[PDB]
Amino acid sequence: SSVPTKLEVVAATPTSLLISWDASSSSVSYYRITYGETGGNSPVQEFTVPGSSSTATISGLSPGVDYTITVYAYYSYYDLYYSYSPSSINYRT
């Protein structure tokens, strides 16, 4: 049952994408955002946003391309982090 909930693209230009999700959790260390072209082992890029954040901008995209966007919620445990049930959506720019 996928976390974070409510992952969506809220605004989009041909090269740019604004996504948001439900960041209700106070224990999330950070959200990890990865994105690549749908299917294709094109390099997935990733960045992270802190656990307090609920939006992020993905830029540098090429028009007419379908991307898969995945958001992992990571939690801390001693000196590691772990994540389960990431959410993903597809979006053709």
Partner: protein, 79 residues
């Protein structure tokens, strides 16, 4: 600011968990986090990597783990 952690995946066939862990962190923490996310104790599960059953004191460095390596978890006899 390096970047001390690698990515590991732990899977049992249904439950899959993604970890960011230091080369020098003992796998105890990963095994404990995975078991306890199942509501189990570390010692009820076995963790397999490269034909080896991983022991709690071993690090990713001890096992020559690589970014994006996979650990198989299964019921019964750790640890």
């Amino acid at each position: 600011k390096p970047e001390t952690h690698i990515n590991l995946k732990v899977s049992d066939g249904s439950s899959e968990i993604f970890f960011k862990i230091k080369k020098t962190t003992p796998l105890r923490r990963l095994m404990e986090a995975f078991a306890k996310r199942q509501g189990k104790e570390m010692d009820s599960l076995r963790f397999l990597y490269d034909g080896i059953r991983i022991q709690a004191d071993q690090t990713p460095e001890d096992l020559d783990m690589e970014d994006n390596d996979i650990i198989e978890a299964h019921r019964e006899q750790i640890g």
